[PDB]
Amino acid sequence: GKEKSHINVVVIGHVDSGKSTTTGHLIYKCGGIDKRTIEKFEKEAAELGKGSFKYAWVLDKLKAERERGITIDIALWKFETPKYQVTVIDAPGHRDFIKNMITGTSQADCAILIIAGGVGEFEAGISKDGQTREHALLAFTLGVRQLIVAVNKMDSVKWDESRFQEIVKETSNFIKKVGYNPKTVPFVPISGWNGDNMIEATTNAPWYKGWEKETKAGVVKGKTLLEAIDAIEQPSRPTDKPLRLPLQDVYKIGGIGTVPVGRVETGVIKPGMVVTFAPAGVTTEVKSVEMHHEQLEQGVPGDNVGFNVKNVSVKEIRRGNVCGDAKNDPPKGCASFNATVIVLNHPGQISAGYSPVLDCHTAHIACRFDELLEKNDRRSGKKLEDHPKFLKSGDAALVKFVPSKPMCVEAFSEYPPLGRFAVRDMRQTVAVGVIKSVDKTXXXXXXXX
Amino acid sequence: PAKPAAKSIVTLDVKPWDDETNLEEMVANVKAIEMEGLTWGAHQFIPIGFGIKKLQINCVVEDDKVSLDDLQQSIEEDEDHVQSTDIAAMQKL
Ligand SMILES: NC(=O)CC[C@H](N)C(=O)O
Numbered sequence: 001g002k003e004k005s006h007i008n009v010v011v012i013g014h015v016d017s018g019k020s021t022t023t024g025h026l027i028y029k030c031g032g033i034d035k036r037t038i039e040k041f042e043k044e045a046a047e048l049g050k051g052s053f054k055y056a057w058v059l060d061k062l063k064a065e066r067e068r069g070i071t072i073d074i075a076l077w078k079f080e081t082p083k084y085q086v087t088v089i090d091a092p093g094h095r096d097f098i099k100n101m102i103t104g105t106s107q108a109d110c111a112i113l114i115i116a117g118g119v120g121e122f123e124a125g126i127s128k129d130g131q132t133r134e135h136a137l138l139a140f141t142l143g144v145r146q147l148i149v150a151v152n153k154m155d156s157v158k159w160d161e162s163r164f165q166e167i168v169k170e171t172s173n174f175i176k177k178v179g180y181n182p183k184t185v186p187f188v189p190i191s192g193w194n195g196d197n198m199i200e201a202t203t204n205a206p207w208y209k210g211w212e213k214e215t216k217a218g219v220v221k222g223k224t225l226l227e228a229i230d231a232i233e234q235p236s237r238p239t240d241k242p243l244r245l246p247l248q249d250v251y252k253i254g255g256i257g258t259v260p261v262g263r264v265e266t267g268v269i270k271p272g273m274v275v276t277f278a279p280a281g282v283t284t285e286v287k288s289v290e291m292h293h294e295q296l297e298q299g300v301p302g303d304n305v306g307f308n309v310k311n312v313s314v315k316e317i318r319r320g321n322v323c324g325d326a327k328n329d330p331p332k333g334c335a336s337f338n339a340t341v342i343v344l345n346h347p348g349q350i351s352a353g354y355s356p357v358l359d360c361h362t363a364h365i366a367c368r369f370d371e372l373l374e375k376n377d378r379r380s381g382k383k384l385e386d387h388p389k390f391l392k393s394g395d396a397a398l399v400k401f402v403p404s405k406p407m408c409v410e411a412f413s414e415y416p417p418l419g420r421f422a423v424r425d426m427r428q429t430v431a432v433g434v435i436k437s438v439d440k441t442x443x444x445x446x447x448x449x
Numbered sequence: 450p451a452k453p454a455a456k457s458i459v460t461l462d463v464k465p466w467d468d469e470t471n472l473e474e475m476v477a478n479v480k481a482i483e484m485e486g487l488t489w490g491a492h493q494f495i496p497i498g499f500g501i502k503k504l505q506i507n508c509v510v511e512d513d514k515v516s517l518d519d520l521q522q523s524i525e526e527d528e529d530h531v532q533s534t535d536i537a538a539m540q541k542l
Pocket residue numbers: 044045047061
C-alpha cells in the first residue's frame with residue numbers, strides 16, 4: 001500500500017436517506033473499525049442459509065451491538081481510498097452536534113449529501129426547516145466548498161433514469177439555494193444496501209454513463225461513490241502559517257512543572273521555540289513536546305500535544321488561552337471583533353445588547369452583540385442595510401462583538417480554526433459566526449500583585 | 450414502539466488533574482452516572498504525554514433524552530478527579 005494524504009468528510013442527510021448504511025459500507029469494505037465484531041457476525045450469518053451473507057445484514061448486527069455498549073472501538077472512524085486516508089463523520093442528529101461541527105476538531109474537506117430516491121422520502125429530506133438543510137448550510141458557511149451528492153435507494157425506484165434526472169434537478173436547486181455550484185458536484189446513483197456504485201459500478205442502469213464535476217483544471221469523471229471521494233481535491237495544510245495552539249488543559253507535573261495540552265491548529269511547535277500565551281501575554285521557551293507514547297521533534301497541525309514550559313505557573317495560563325510563536329505574529333487578546341453571523345432557526349430574535357455564550361476554539365465566553373452593523377445577502381455578502389434593528393432566523397449580518405472576559409480570536413481568513421464560533425442559547429446553537437476583523441490590544445507582575 | 454429512537458455514539462475524553470489522579474475512581478464515577486437513554490460502553494486509559502493518561506469512554510445516547518452538555522457538566526462535578534471533558538468523536542447510529 002502506498003502513502004496516503006489525509007482528508008475529512010462529513011456525511012449528511014435525512015433520517016430516511018440510508019446514510020448510516022452507506023457510510024458503514026465504506027468503512028466496512030475500505031477501513032478497519034470494530035472488525036472483531038464484523039467477523040463475529042460474518043460467521044454467524046451462516047445460519048441464514050448455507051454461508052452467504054449481505055454486508056448490510058452484518059452492518060445491522062454491528063449497529064445493534066454498538067447500542068448494547070459492548071463494541072470496543074471509539075467513534076473516530078476512518079477508511080481508505082487509493083489516494084487518501086479519510087476520517088469520516090456520519091453526522092449525528094443530536095442537537096449538541098451543531099456546536100461540535102463548528103468548533104470541534106477538523107473541518108470537513110468535503111460534505112457528502114445522501115438523498116433518498118423514493119417520492120415521499122425525497123420531499124421530506126429537502127424541507128427548508130429540516131436538519132439536513134441546516135447541516136448543509138453550516139458546512140457551506142464554514143468553508144466546506146466541496147460536495148458530493150449520492151442518490152440512494154435507487155432500487156426502490158427501479159433504477160429509473162427520469163427519476164434520477166428529476167432528483168438531480170431538484171437537489172441542484174436545493175444546494176444552489178444553500179450556495180453550492182451544482183456544476184462542481186458529482187451526482188452518484190447508489191444502493192447503500194446492495195452495493196451498487198459504492199465501490200464497484202452498477203449493472204442495474206445501462207443508461208448510467210457516470211458522474212462528472214467541473215474543476216479548475218478540467219472535468220473529472222467516474223462511476224462510483226468511492227471514485228468521487230478519491231477525486232476530492234487536496235486541501236492546503238497550514239504548516240507554514242504562524243503557530244496557533246489553543247489550550248485544552250494545563251497540568252502541574254511533579255519533577256516536570258507546567259504542561260499545557262492542546263491541538264496545533266496552524267504552524268508547527270518545536271522544542272527550543274519561544275512561545276507566547278494570549279491573552280495574558282506570558283512568554284517562555286518550549287522545553288519538550290510529547291504526544292501519546294512518543295516524544296516529538298515537532299508537533300504539526302492536527303497533533304494534540306503536551307509540552308513543558310518553565311517559569312509559567314498553572315495559574316497564569318488556562319483552557320481557552322492560545323499559544324503561538326513569539327517570533328512570528330504572536331497571538332494577542334482583543335478589545336472587540338466583527339463577525340458575519342448566520343442566525344439559525346430558533347425561538348427568538350436578536351437585538352443589540354444580546355450577550356450569550358460563544359464557543360470559539362477552546363474558549364467559552366459570553367460576548368455582547370455590541371452593534372448590528374449590517375444585514376447582508378448571505379451567499380454574495382452584499383450589504384442590504386446599515387444598522388438593522390434586529391436579526392431573525394435566516395439572516396446574515398455583520399456584528400461587532402465585545403468579549404466579557406479576555407479573549408484571543410483571529411480573522412477566519414488568517415487562522416480559520418480561531419475564526420469560527422458557535423452562539424449558544426435556549427439549549428441549542430442559535431447562530432454560527434465567521435470573524436472578519438479583530439481589534440487587537442505594561443503592568444509588572446510585582447505591580448499586578 | 451414499532452420504531453426506534455434516534456441515537457448517537459459518543460466518545461468522551463475525561464481529563465485528570467495530574468499524573469497521580471486515581472483513574473479507576475475517575476471512571477467508576479463516570480459510569481455511576483445514570484440517565485434515561487444513556488448506555489455506557491467501552492473505555493481505555495490513553496497516555497497523552499508526560500505520564501498523564503486521559504480516560505476515553507464510549508457511550509450511546511438517545512438524542513431526544515440525553516443532553517451531552519448536561520452529561521459533560523455532570524461528569525465535571527467530580528472535581529477531585531476531573532479537570533475537563535471533551536468530545537473525542539461522535540457518530541450517528
Ligand atoms: N438471525 C438473527 O437474527 C440472529 C443474529 C445474530 N446471529 C445473533 O444471534 O444475535
